[model samples]
Target: ACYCRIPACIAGERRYGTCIAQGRLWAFCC
Candidate 1:
């Protein structure tokens, strides 16, 4: 699972800053 500290997206599920090879900005999503 992805992990960070964004605190955004659907409240039902736990989502955060998902680090990817894309670089810099994280994909804060589910």
Candidate 2:
């Protein structure tokens, strides 16, 4: 599992962009 910082246009308030999950590749921002 890993996370990245997203831009304000994508997410605000120190949001995160998840790129992996459960031994699989996934993408989501929150």
Candidate 3:
């Protein structure tokens, strides 16, 4: 699981940043 803290989303979930599967860790935050 990953955590992403965006200042704001321009288009809700449609344009929200998500965590990409990177190895065994989700790369949303970084």
Candidate 4:
């Protein structure tokens, strides 16, 4: 499963959602 916080998708950034996949955590940035 995946979860997200406020300010979804920052300025000039594609995504800002944080998620856990295959027991690993990843975050999108600008």
Candidate 5:
């Protein structure tokens, strides 16, 4: 529940770089 955070999938789930892994830290997401 913050800005650019990406550990939680909004109750949906991953899809970005596969399992939501994209880039950065704190969206540094996966």
Candidate 6:
């Protein structure tokens, strides 16, 4: 946790982006 430099309190509400390449895979696979 500390290694990533992200504060523990803020982790719960964090928003992240998935890779465009990975998202494409899911669409095609489904």
Which has the greatest lDDT?
A: 4
Clashing pairs in 4: none
Could you give candidate 2's per-residue lDDT for residues 1-30 as a string of tens digits?
334333232434333445554566534444
Candidate lDDT scores, in order, read 0.49, 0.42, 0.39, 0.52, 0.38, 0.27
Per-structure clash totals for the candidates: 0, 0, 0, 0, 2, 0
Q: Kindly state the number of residue pairs that clash in model 6.
A: 0
lDDT of 1 by residue, 1-30 (tens): 444334345555555456555455444555
User: Tens-digit lDDT track for model 4 on 1-30?
Assistant: 233424354455565557666776656454
Q: What is the lDDT of residue 25 in candidate 5?
A: 42
- Clashing residue pairs in candidate 2 (N, C-alpha, C atoms within 3 angstroms): none
TM-score for each model? 0.21, 0.23, 0.16, 0.34, 0.16, 0.15
Candidate 6 lDDT over residue span 1-30, tens digit each = 212222222434333322235234211110
Give the C-alpha miss distance for residue 9 in model 4, angstroms. 11
Ranking by lDDT: 4, 1, 2, 3, 5, 6
Worst 10 residues of 2 by lDDT: 1-10
Task: Give the Cα-based TM-score of candidate 2 against the true structure.
Answer: 0.23
RMSD of every prediction: 5.3, 7.2, 8.4, 7.9, 6.9, 12.0
Better of 4 and 5 by TM-score: 4
lDDT (Cα) of model 1: 0.49
Whole-model lDDT for model 2 versus the true structure?
Answer: 0.42
